[PDB]
Design an enzyme around this catalytic site. Structure first.
Site, short mmCIF file in Angstrom:
data_model
loop_
_atom_site.label_atom_id
_atom_site.label_comp_id
_atom_site.label_asym_id
_atom_site.label_seq_id
_atom_site.Cartn_x
_atom_site.Cartn_y
_atom_site.Cartn_z
CE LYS A 1 -22.85 -13.34 7.87
NZ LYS A 1 -21.36 -13.17 7.85
NE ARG B 1 -4.00 -2.14 2.11
CZ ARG B 1 -5.28 -2.05 2.45
NH1 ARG B 1 -5.77 -0.93 2.96
NH2 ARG B 1 -6.10 -3.08 2.22
N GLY C 1 -15.41 -3.12 0.59
CA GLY C 1 -16.70 -2.53 0.92
C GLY C 1 -17.10 -1.41 -0.04
N1 LIG Z 1 -16.17 -21.95 2.29
C1 LIG Z 1 -16.21 -20.96 3.23
N2 LIG Z 1 -16.64 -21.19 4.51
C2 LIG Z 1 -16.67 -20.23 5.44
N3 LIG Z 1 -16.24 -18.99 5.14
C3 LIG Z 1 -15.80 -18.69 3.91
C4 LIG Z 1 -15.78 -19.68 2.91
N4 LIG Z 1 -15.31 -19.10 1.83
C5 LIG Z 1 -15.00 -17.83 2.09
N5 LIG Z 1 -15.30 -17.59 3.37
C6 LIG Z 1 -15.04 -16.32 4.14
O1 LIG Z 1 -15.72 -15.17 3.64
C7 LIG Z 1 -14.93 -14.05 4.07
C8 LIG Z 1 -14.88 -12.99 3.01
O2 LIG Z 1 -16.26 -12.69 2.72
P1 LIG Z 1 -16.73 -11.18 2.67
O3 LIG Z 1 -18.12 -11.07 2.19
O4 LIG Z 1 -16.53 -10.53 3.98
O5 LIG Z 1 -15.63 -10.62 1.70
P2 LIG Z 1 -15.46 -9.56 0.60
O6 LIG Z 1 -16.60 -9.67 -0.35
O7 LIG Z 1 -14.01 -9.96 0.01
C9 LIG Z 1 -15.34 -7.89 1.30
F1 LIG Z 1 -15.21 -7.05 0.28
F2 LIG Z 1 -16.47 -7.66 2.00
C10 LIG Z 1 -14.10 -7.80 2.18
C11 LIG Z 1 -14.00 -6.41 2.83
C12 LIG Z 1 -12.54 -5.94 2.80
C13 LIG Z 1 -12.24 -4.79 3.79
F3 LIG Z 1 -13.06 -4.70 4.82
F4 LIG Z 1 -11.04 -4.98 4.29
P3 LIG Z 1 -12.24 -3.18 2.95
O8 LIG Z 1 -11.58 -2.14 3.87
O9 LIG Z 1 -11.35 -3.30 1.71
O10 LIG Z 1 -13.68 -2.73 2.68
C14 LIG Z 1 -13.56 -14.52 4.52
O11 LIG Z 1 -13.27 -14.26 5.89
C15 LIG Z 1 -13.55 -16.00 4.15
O12 LIG Z 1 -12.74 -16.83 5.02
#
Ligand SMILES: Nc1ncnc2c1ncn2[C@@H]1O[C@H](COP(=O)(O)OP(=O)(O)C(F)(F)CCCC(F)(F)P(=O)(O)O)[C@@H](O)[C@H]1O
Length: 415
Positions: A215, A35, A395
């Protein structure tokens, strides 16, 4: 459309730049300076044009303290809201090493009037973590305005280059430009705005949306806005299990949302009606518990053994998804395909990044990855450079794709 740093008068100006220096640190050492490196071109531009830089950023999620208590604290000689784990001091040192020039660290972002006053063109000052103050991300405009007033007094022109925090109002993202009366996009922000505008406009077809994460509920608004714009929908992560369970497959102990089974069936129905080809996992990598193992169980089809939880898309699914991406001219990806945090469950995520990078490098595919672990996968495997765009905000990128406008973008001047 939004004014960028290239359109700003910077010579002789003290430039306030909201940067993304939220790097991972362990025992006081930065474990990934990616970064910081990405911020260099924006900073170099200011210096090249003859301005000086007052950098603002956050690190981690510190508790924060109200501004009112700052006075007392400073008298004791302490730093308001300080937390060793979240100090930007090592970032200042790393930035200096990368810029090959001095970087003065101001230990308190709201008490830097003196050091700032002594700045000359060519100087770089990094203020301490802005989240050491509660008002930084306050829901009250007055709270944000009060903090922003102090920060705005530290400079002449505002540059925003932290897209990841642009989806929410904050003293540093929206307060400062408001008070200052000007604001423009740095190079990273400029690219983010451009690429998402492209994907929501009339991108090259076929367009595939790859959606993962934990989810289905978190991705419903994305689907609401994107279903009518795509040709293929590839679903992974735990989001996939709610769909597979709804259809009738056994998912064992896999993460799912029972409250969303009806939604899943309706979505699949809607997709068929709109003639969008939806592809769900056709095999899985699983284990008996949420832990890493060297040789996880790999299923032959959609069904997951009772007593096992699926943790990544399997080999056959990766093959299918990669092949689908090969048929497209545009690809947007949000959410990892599995538990990327653990090595044995990271293959699916790495594979999508590989397919997308190759598509762009060898065929001109317009590939956009929406932050999070999907972006990390691309970064770690060296695919980020081959991609059309890898977003720095999970996000924020999702909100744009949901059809929402970002406070941090709207506040900037138009060109
Ligand atoms: N088979 C499985 N079983 C259980 N869990 C599972 C899985 N497959 C994936 N996951 C879990 O789902 C999570 C990521 O989902 P998410 O909806 O929070 O992610 P995102 O869309 O990358 C997001 F964009 F929201 C991430 C946000 C990033 C941030 F917050 F850092 P930002 O600051 O960039 O906004 C991880 O912790 C992962 O381990």
């Amino acid at each position: 459309e939004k004014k960028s740093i290239n359109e700003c008068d910077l010579k002789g100006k003290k430039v306030l730049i909201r940067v993304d220096f939220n790097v991972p640190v362990k025992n006081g050492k930065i474990t990934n300076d990616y970064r910081i490196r990405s911020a260099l071109p924006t900073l170099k531009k200011v210096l090249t044009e003859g301005g000086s830089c007052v950098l603002m950023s956050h690190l981690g999620r510190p508790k924060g303290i109200p501004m009112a208590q700052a006075g007392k604290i400073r008298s004791t000689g302490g730093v308001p809201g300080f937390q060793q784990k979240a100090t930007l001091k090592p970032v200042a040192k790393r930035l200096s090493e990368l810029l090959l020039r001095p970087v003065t660290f101001a230990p308190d972002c709201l008490n830097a009037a003196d050091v700032v006053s002594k700045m000359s063109p060519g100087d770089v000052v990094l203020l301490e973590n802005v989240r050491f103050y509660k008002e930084e991300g306050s829901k009250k405009a007055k709270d944000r305005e009060a903090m922003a007033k102090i920060l705005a007094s530290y400079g002449d022109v505002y540059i925003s280059d932290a897209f990841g925090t642009a989806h929410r109002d904050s003293a540093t993202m929206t307060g400062i430009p408001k008070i200052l009366g000007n604001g423009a996009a740095g190079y990273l922000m400029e690219k983010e705005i451009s690429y998402f505008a492209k994907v929501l406009g009339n991108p090259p077809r076929p367009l595939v949306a790859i959606v993962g994460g934990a989810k289905v509920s978190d991705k419903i608004q994305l689907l609401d806005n994107m279903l009518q714009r795509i040709d293929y929908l590839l679903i992974g992560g735990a989001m996939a299990y709610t769909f597979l369970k709804a259809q009738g497959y056994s998912i064992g102990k896999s993460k799912c949302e029972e409250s969303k089974l009806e939604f899943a069936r309706s979505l699949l129905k809607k997709a068929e009606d709109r003639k969008v080809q939806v592809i769900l996992p056709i095999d899985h990598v699983c284990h008996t518990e949420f832990k890493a193992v060297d040789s996880p169980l790999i299923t032959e089809d959609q069904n997951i053994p009772e007593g096992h939880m699926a943790l990544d898309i399997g080999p056959k699914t990766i093959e299918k998804y990669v092949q689908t991406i090969g048929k497209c001219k545009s690809a947007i990806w949000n959410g990892p395909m599995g538990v990327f945090e653990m090595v044995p469950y990271s293959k699916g995520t790495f594979a999508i990044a590989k397919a997308m990078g190759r598509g762009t490098h060898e065929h001109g595919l317009m590939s956009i990855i929406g932050g999070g672990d999907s972006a990390s996968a691309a970064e770690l495997s060296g695919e980020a450079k081959r991609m059309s765009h890898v977003s720095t905000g999970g996000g924020a990128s999702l909100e744009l794709l949901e059809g929402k406008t970002l406070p941090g973008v709207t506040v900037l001047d138009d060109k």
